[PDB]
Point group: D2
Chain length 217, copies 4
Amino acid sequence: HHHHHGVTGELRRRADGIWQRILAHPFVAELYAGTLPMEKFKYYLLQDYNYLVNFAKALSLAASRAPSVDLMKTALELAYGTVTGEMANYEALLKEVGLSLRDAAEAEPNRVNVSYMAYLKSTCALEGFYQCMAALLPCFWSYAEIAERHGGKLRENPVHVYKKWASVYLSPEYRGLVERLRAVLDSSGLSAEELWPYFKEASLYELEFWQAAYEGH
Amino acid sequence: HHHGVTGELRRRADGIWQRILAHPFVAELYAGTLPMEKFKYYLLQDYNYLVNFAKALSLAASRAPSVDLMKTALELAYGTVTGEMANYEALLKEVGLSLRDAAEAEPNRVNVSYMAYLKSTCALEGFYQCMAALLPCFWSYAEIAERHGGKLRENPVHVYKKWASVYLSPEYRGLVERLRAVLDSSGLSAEELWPYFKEASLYELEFWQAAYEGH
Amino acid sequence: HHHHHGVTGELRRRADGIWQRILAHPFVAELYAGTLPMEKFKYYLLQDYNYLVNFAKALSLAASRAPSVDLMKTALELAYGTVTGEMANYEALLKEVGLSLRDAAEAEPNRVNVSYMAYLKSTCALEGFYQCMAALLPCFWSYAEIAERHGGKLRENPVHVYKKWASVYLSPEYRGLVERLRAVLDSSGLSAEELWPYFKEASLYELEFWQAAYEGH
Amino acid sequence: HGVTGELRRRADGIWQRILAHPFVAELYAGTLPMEKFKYYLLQDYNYLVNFAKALSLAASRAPSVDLMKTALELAYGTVTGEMANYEALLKEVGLSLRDAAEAEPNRVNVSYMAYLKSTCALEGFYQCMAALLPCFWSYAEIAERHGGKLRENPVHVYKKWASVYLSPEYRGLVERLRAVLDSSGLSAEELWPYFKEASLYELEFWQAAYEGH
Ligand SMILES: Cc1ncc(CO)c(N)n1
Ligand SMILES: Cc1ncc(CO)c(N)n1
Ligand SMILES: Cc1ncc(CO)c(N)n1
Ligand SMILES: Cc1ncc(CO)c(N)n1
């Protein structure tokens, strides 16, 4: 309840309907429980890796237009940090699961992936810096909160790769990317209302992305 | 209309295009049986589209690899403010909707996605790849007209007929024709351009469906 | 006197130092007087078409993120109304002087040209829409004011091409362009201070451009 | 040896002027007046910010995941490497980040920053890299040439400034950027105009910093 401090708290609360569906999504619950079929995870990894590449490009775009040096530093940190944290982890997860980077490059993105990646890049290439951040926040934050909610099931999760995947989102370093991004938005000088459309769309794509990964769309 | 790279693209997208061509929204629209509320809903959505479409052409224009290609991109763009957009401005007014209503209409999810796809592409990808993403949007509407044009003669609704007149017009067809020749002169293969032509085509299908369900 | 009004008037008056140097530049005075050596004009035409081409692209970029349909409609007009006007005539100015569009494509831009074109494109790709307009205004406005100042010497100007060149910048269609550009900025709600850096740099480039054209750089 | 070697050789006339520039020679020797260094730090810090933005743009358009990573590592390594140093240098010399934000860029700086951002937002990825290479590489080579004068350079800040360009980590950014270009699939000739313009700006930038513009 105390995360509901400022602008970003307001945004999170407005998206509660969406986020509760994300938090309660069967893909998520199964993944953390250890019951998710490995083929679905494989399919998810292929899709999500492509999303991360394009997510890094989106951060790059936002960085190209940061209204201050510090803000530019934050976006770059989020971008290199995405390559150095998540993507490195994914690269290793693919390898352990018998998928190559070439397989990744050859995996066709599903429709939601195309649309979501498009939305983030479009926004980050054309909208105000803080609007971009608002569009990028749900991606970062939802994954942390998902972890914060289903973390307990990991101790009973028999699958090693699912646990390794989840470890990033429980890590203080990842929660710090989240905290840092929220701090940027809470001090942006802009209202929750101005930021809402961006935060909302991205949140809706996060829900469709999990669904798409669940039904191997 | 199957003689070069764009013909190759069209034929590879046949599965998708046939679904578009046979979509109930389209058939009803040309037949004159489409409920006015669905048309209104469609007009609101499509304006936001066209505005963003214009921006996409602008972006593509911004890095045409030749003056000619830029001049082209740029015409299609301005010609989208005074060509399709002008028309739509009237069509709305006749239906009792203001530009303000247009500005206030929330785009549906497909519209957001599609607009994002075109702008994203046009801001980032090679000029020809952008054109390949933009072609289905232009061409499908011409072909839709080429297919359902006959029903207009029996179509009792004036606004639907006025809407359709643009896509039957030689000026629109020529636009389409020129756009193809740009691509067919690109010197790139179909498979290089396929992904872009495909996605856009898929969006066109989802757009009609979204307009049909009042999404 | 009545170009003293609002934000753009403020900008003009701050750039007075720079603008008076432009308005009194020998290239300009000789061009209107009819004394400018044809070779310098030819050189100028080669450079300036490359400019106009890139100017068009810059408008296109600004258009790409106009914050309103009206503002966008404008940008798009200038960008196309630059292929349609200025660029169209220039094509005739060159043909008359025995230079082809191919010659234009092959003319290497001088360093100022490169720099200026880069500045406009860079700005229009990255900066706020109004900031872009502020960068673009000097280019438009200086040429009108140059005409407003040296227009009288045209009746005594024996060179037809120079007079044809000048006719655009005396035309109500061009002068109005400037008027609309100014009103766009004057209604922005942005201060002079915020727009100054962009107006200034462009103005400095206009001065260097004339100098470069004068010395055959 | 490869495409980038070809580029360097073609720009030899320009680079020898950069390598022999009095600003550079004085900076490494320790004879550069502190006011000129201060003036340079203000200008160059602004340049590095915009240089990072340029790399960001080029990254947004990398034709491969790996290429996107390289640009990203260059951009971020520019923040955490060179920019962090300049921040320490500015502070040690009594200049704030605010002073930096308020410093008006000189004409060459505006033009050079514009060139890089223009290119990186609109040209092919490898053309961008060709535009960015001279910036990175010239500084390494300058260091490679004037490094010896440092041992006896009495000025600490000049030495600290130079330390980055002698460092294996900075040379690695350079080597990695060359390798990207050497295997780009493109000719020296296609890349030349970009490498050249940047090189010419590097020379004007030093001159501008020397004359206090
Ligand atoms: C679709 C998606 N959203 C968010 C994340 C976490 O940044 C991810 N890896 N993938
Ligand atoms: C969605 C859509 N596609 C194409 C056109 C015609 O360019 C249009 N008006 N709307
Ligand atoms: C350099 C220059 N500036 C302005 C104009 C007028 O837009 C022009 N034609 N050339
Ligand atoms: C002007 C300039 N060129 C190159 C470097 C090295 O990246 C720098 N810091 N500044």
